[model samples]
Target: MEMEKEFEQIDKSGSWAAIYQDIRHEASDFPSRVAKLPKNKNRNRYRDVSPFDHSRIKLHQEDNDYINASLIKMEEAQRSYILTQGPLPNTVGHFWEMVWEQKSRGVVMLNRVMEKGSLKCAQYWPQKEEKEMIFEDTNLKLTLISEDIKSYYTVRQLELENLTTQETREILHFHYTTWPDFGVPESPASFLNFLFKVRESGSLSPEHGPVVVHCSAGIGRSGTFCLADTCLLLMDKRKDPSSVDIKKVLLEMRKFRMGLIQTADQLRFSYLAVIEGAKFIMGD
Candidate 1:
């Protein structure tokens, strides 16, 4: 599989075309088959039948207003986006700084997302100068870059352990493979399980909060996760059958955080992911 070989070269800093080709090959045969499948126009036509849709139907003016207000507050809270270059800095120091800045203001800095190599280097620094400073200090709330893109998942795991003091800190791992390979229609089910685990573990909420996510640049896969999370939250809160305004949500996100899964392809996949979530609820 030349495409597989090309995928292996993703982290080597090659051309975008090469990486695209690799992903294309990785999702081979599925796109064509998916295109041939009959469209379910009535799949989610009746939203009341689905628990997800039923819940959304209860979104009142106050509820929508509150969500809008909260989103605004969140936007204001996440004003400063972290972009680290060169040797990775101490995770503890970063967390402390973020925490301190938002302490009295009621603002919450989501979490740190580091480059792949930087995350690894922090874990295996080997020097006692930063012995206790580990990525897991921020907690095991991290996400992989992309399944299509090559990355050191094992190393990221080790880094996660260092940051976490708990016997087992909850970690949310994401892999973006094409449809049918996992016997599912899309990636939303796996992602939902990840979110569910985090929520069940009591690590992810407005107060306790999940550590957020990570990837190479901490943008692509991480952004997708964040967007999906927001979508789910809206569905849960709104309880309406109508689709949440994804463009509005994403635009708001992008305004505050730059490089937030900006590519059209990423945006399209995000929409599909939401549809998959709807499908899971509707069973259509």
Candidate 2:
């Protein structure tokens, strides 16, 4: 009951600001030498947000191997996620290449391509009518096989092909389009519904490679999803669900990638989402 009690105490005392700041103050940081290199500058969407060298996913390309993506692996939770920024127009090909090289089964997109006149992410996937996109940079082709639209999100089945090898792989693209601009979802129910939708596809399972998760800068919303998912997983596995420490779990995730759970609001939303998510797994 401590988690709930603490959540309530924070909620009642309006101490979320302090709690969020403490979590950030305690977050760990690591070197990102490769992301700072001059040649890789254009590949990064934001100069401020860079992947730690230790956990950055390196594409096997000869001269160019950097991507603004980091591998966040929580062994205890039995989860792995690739948190990266929205792909740039030029990096879109490299984005698919990362998916192919990493063997990821799903991509969790938390932001839209354009948000209030600002370009948040590139049009990485093919449109419904276009159906297919070929990338010369990485010699990869992405074909849209199916599109399923919902009220707040869209699910698409994509086929990725290696041009030279002629091998193809199926990828699940889960786009939570309704996430507010620089804010949390309207309600935890809707967010968890989408989260479980991705979960139901078995794309988040260990049998598959890590799911690629991204937002505008790849920290705020993406980190929120990963934190909630991992905490819920830990709660399900632990005999005492309340023993799962959301802050500690998030701090650990931050060790692999920097600036997770961007704002105090996002940190608070993670707590709210996880608490709501437990009811489904643990019951009232």
Candidate 3:
């Protein structure tokens, strides 16, 4: 199709590999920062996927800690999101520690418990049918206050407790049920609607530390969501949404988390969603 011609400016070969290689060549060895983390402390099973330290979240625990998570802030849009890999069996404690330490109001999960016959993310939250879920590693408990099921997503009210301090904090979990792993949404409308629902909650605001955004790897789907959300804010600020530079903005996004917008189709889909979202914002 004409997508190749239109995006030739960004990738003459029309392949994400080439675009990724081009960006990789221009960037620094950021992953080495994650390597400097305590060897026995790394949580990610996959070596290539690691957090960049310039913006990586540091735990304030008075004890040894380990987790695969990063804090990526988009200053221009005044939006901040914590991009992290799916919680590992051992790192789930570290994940909540991040939320508690950073004071994040919500967790934007882009992956499900399982995908394609394989376990993708850990069961990080409590079940509605159960009393609550507890992780002995962090001494933090999660109690399900309420759950609102919907056609394509579910909103859950959760209470996180600090066993040591005997204090509790409310955390929102926004799970997009239908989004495919490493793929785009069926259409932009549904995606944007889900996004607005998150935005209205004030979790993505600068007032909070950063909304936790994650998927299995916390790069592909996580990147797409943040990129689309950031572009929507850009469209809102300027006179014309089309004036925003999608490619330029994506490169800046990649700086925070490695391997963002993994495929050309995802990149293509982001443009579609931005255009659709612009109309929605402008009409409002």
Candidate 4:
């Protein structure tokens, strides 16, 4: 009741819309020089959404080092997240290369390959029948080892190998299939349950590089996941759980990656998840 009540103020005072507008108005227009290059144009899924240069992840390739990905670090919350757009057909290998180079143990995918009959993300991973897929550009091979499907989500085990080095690593692909494009999840319970499942794997820990989180554009659903997780973590660390400020935390996150949370509903859903997560943390 306390946690919900505190956040309820924003809903009652009609500040949610105002707060979202504030974020858009105060958003920094960081340069995405590499994303704008004529050569790298096709790599981006959406023309408007590009990773900021300073915090964008660099690929260790032949001559090119560009991927539509961002590294957002929340120091106080003790978290670091690699928020990136869904891999394009050509960038799939680069995506696996990033996971290998960064030593990312897991990937949190929040969108489907097909949304509303349109191709939101490329069919990046291998299926049971295909079993394996190869990216000649990054010289990485991905194999689907196993799949555990839930009602709302699916947990996939994939093996990544650098064709050149012949070294391989296992990657956990947590795909939340039911989440709509640019919309919130069914409920805080469902979303938090998925969040904890990812947390249970210990992939989000600092001991690892960073968990790769993505959606269609890598901001709406992806940002919602990161914001809720970070805020709940802040509450976990503080003496007062309610002291956490969702908006402030989002602004801090936007510094590393542009457009963290996309809509007022998404922002509200974030608070709902944080509040619901607190019930587990505080044993309320």
Candidate 5:
């Protein structure tokens, strides 16, 4: 009942196109945070995408700790999201380094290893069970413990260890493989189902470190994932889904990652997915 009302409320908001425009226009003004130092110029794989010096996450003892990643925490929603770019060929070790140093219990990958004939992200982890990968750059080792492949997603159990400290911890890697087709957008149920799966693992729990989330540039799909998750929690807590402002929430998220929720279609999809997610989260 409340969920339906919230949907209607957004539907009556002078059409989605107008609201999306407001998002884009206001989002453009949200301050620039990208900082590319002379030393890190060659370190970054993408010329345009770099972490903001203010919010960037740096490795404790590693010289090149910045891999265009940021730690995002929304206290009201009880969500902590680490937004980062896809690891480049040489930065795979740093990617694993961040995971281990942060004691992150899980990682949420929103893109595939290959996309549109391009290597959007590196094959950073071990592929098969019992297979081990050694990163000479950081001396970090990853071993695949198990994998559960589903229709639209793949969940892998991985063990991460620091060779120098001999510290090892298990990490959950949840990969959402399907690309959203504007012609036939994926049903929100499918996405919500995956969201629940990630939640059930308790990686999002405050007891563990922040769950690292990344895509090609760590903004578009990755931002959408974090937005939907945060909004759903807001709706549940408020008991009235519309009580929260979607645009305001998004602008807040942009502080963590530039151009998050990239396209207008993606922003639209966030609403669709979050509304459906609220239904399940509220036990309706």
Candidate 6:
């Protein structure tokens, strides 16, 4: 018996006009592009039919609560933690509440300040000053880490505010590392080296406990970072051998963590990032 390839390649060398026209003509119901399977009927059924439990879940307010609580609880039970890039105070408060609910669980909360600007003035929320005022009321004494290479001086300023740069009984200086720009692939070796440095310095571990990570919106860049970390960990166990199915994982992540990555381009880049990362780890 002879082996045969299962798929065929088309000469799609910039000659797609005719095919596109045919597709447009044959598919009269296609709205602009092929309409996604009626979201309300198929994939979004759960969301659509879900009862309005105002007390348990309000759109943004309640959803954030659920997500933060779930992530923290999972971390506590599994003795591992998830990384969030950007931390809005509401989300941070939700997390802090959950941590406190667990009897003020000794879990360390680390804030990675990758950009300059007061937390209250973060552009994401127009009422920044008010929000910052509210957060200050909590007075959580948030451990700030400067992950931005461009802002060493700003980091020093944070240090002067009694923020310890040295290892201590609490979380240490921000576990900083250089990540690629949005939509660009990052080097896995560099990421692995970072983890190694943290371990060697005894800053992070399951026994010593998991670390918290955040960036800005807590979705795009942060989600990508978390996904990449998850993939790398799975790879260590000889799981996710093909580096495929990452899309499914990402989609599922979005269900719990809405708008994990907003743009289609960013989503596509995420797939490429994982593949590139895997190749780097495999020495390809």
| Model 6: per-residue Cα lDDT over 127-166, one tens digit each | 2212322233223334333333332111111111111232
Per-residue lDDT of candidate 4, residues 1-284 (tens digit):
35487567877897888879998888778888989999998899989999999999999867999999999988888799999999988888888889999999999999889888899888998887376787887788888999999998999989888889899888899998887654566677878889999999988987889999999899988999999888888877899876787777888898888888888888888888887788788876
Q: Candidate 3 lDDT (Cα, whole model)? A: 0.79
Residue 109, model 4, lDDT? 93
Candidate 4 — worst ten consecutive residues by lDDT sum?
1-10
On the 0 to 100 scale, the lDDT of residue 104 in model 6 is: 25
On lDDT, who's better, 3 or 4?
4
Candidate lDDT values, in order: 0.36, 0.90, 0.79, 0.87, 0.78, 0.36
Where is model 4 more than 4 Å wrong at Cα?
A: 1-3
Ranking by TM-score: 2, 4, 5, 3, 6, 1
Angstrom error at residue 73, model 5: 1.3
Question: Candidate 3 at 38: error in angstroms?
Answer: 6.4
Residues forming the 10-long window of minimal summed lDDT in candidate 2? 179-188
For residues 84-176, write the lDDT of model 1, one tens digit per residue.
111234333333323222221111111223332333212222222233333443343322322222221111121223233434232332223
> Which is the leading candidate under TM-score?
2
Note the residue pairs that clash in candidate 3: none
Model 2, C-alpha of 222: deviation from truth (Å) = 0.2
Off by over 4 Å in 2: 129-131
| Candidate with maximal lDDT | 2
TM-score of each: 0.43, 0.97, 0.88, 0.95, 0.89, 0.46
Report how far off residue 239 is in candidate 4 (Å).
Answer: 1.6
Give the alpha carbon lDDT tens digit for every residue of 1-284 in model 2: 55778888888999988998888788887899999999988898898999999999999889789899999989899899999999998899889999998889999999989998899989999986475788997999898999999998999999999998999999999999888765676578889999999999988998888999999999999999999999998988988887898888988999999999888888778888988888888876
lDDT of 2: 0.90
Error of 6 at 158 (Å): 9.5
Between candidates 1 and 5, which one is better according to TM-score? 5
